[PDB]
Amino acid sequence: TCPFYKKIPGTGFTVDAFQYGVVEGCTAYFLTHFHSDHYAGLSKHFTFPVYCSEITGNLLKNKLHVQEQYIHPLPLDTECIVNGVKVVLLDANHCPGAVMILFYLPNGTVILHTGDFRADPSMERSLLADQKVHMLYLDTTYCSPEYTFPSQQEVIRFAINTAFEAVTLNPHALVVCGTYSIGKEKVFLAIADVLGSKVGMSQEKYKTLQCLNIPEINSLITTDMCSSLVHLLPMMQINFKGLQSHLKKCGGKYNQILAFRPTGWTHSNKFTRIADVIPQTKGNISIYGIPYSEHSSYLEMKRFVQWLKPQKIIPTVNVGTWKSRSTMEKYFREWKLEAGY
Ligand code: NI
């Protein structure tokens, strides 16, 4: 059964609620983004209207085989009427195709559902500038001050400068990048661009990337692994054993691997600056964990919410423990007392 924080009151709508069977009263199911915890339950046998971005709809059609007649893509930044209710989709600064949803309820209440997001000051000049929000359904993934990490731009600068130095020193080094979902594509694209290479990958991953509307993508990626010196592998294979096994398959073209594991936050962010990050090394293999986040830091979250000044906040992440819920409620009250709303 569908929990309360996935229902939009005063509507027939749900958000990210496909794992509960037929939800009573639901006339339109919104999907914020194509990550498995959020699409859990969708398949080719789904027969209710799904509302989403264009990119999410391409993934639903080609990867999950949802039939076309049930996929309803909406443009961004555009007032649309769905089942009698005005909605707008906004870019969430998460993975490709990820949106926030503004719902203008028939009684005058305005609700923002962030989906998953990485808050940014650019959002203060979207269609949110124009009006009041009564209820915020908030991605609280990193809602605690210990969760710190660098800008995506600093992380990419580190990755490009590390990969270019290593391969210039040794032209026979291979670079490998891990992946297990969409998102974080700039990691492997930026490294392959500085190296003058296409990115090589499985047919399954190529198919996924071909759904993302990335400009000039045919110029950037390939399934011909032999032609490429930046390879994508499943995240599970990014370890000394899996990398060794991969290097064997490359027919003596290479004599070294440099690998990247994009993570979210890890406790080494408590101690180590991005500049000072070092790899784990075994023989001719080195593995870097890089803190590339597609969720708000504590400070980015707090800025967003203090600017928006919502009347009520409903967390959508970390909702399962009393300790998490009490921690988040304390920070919401601090923020409100500090800013005066
Ligand atoms: Ni997500």
Swiss-Prot record:
Tissue specificity remark: Expressed in brain, heart, kidney, liver, pancreas, placenta and skeletal muscle.
Quaternary structure and interacting proteins, as annotated: Binds constitutively to TP53BP1. Binds CDC27, which is itself a component of the anaphase promoting complex (APC). Binds PIAS1.
Segments passing through the bilayer: none
Family, per entry: Belongs to the DNA repair metallo-beta-lactamase (DRMBL) family.
GO BP of this protein: cell division; double-strand break repair via nonhomologous end joining; interstrand cross-link repair
Major localization listed first in the record, in broad terms: nucleus
Portion held of the full protein: 700 to 1040 of 1040
Protein's name according to its UniProt entry: DNA cross-link repair 1A protein
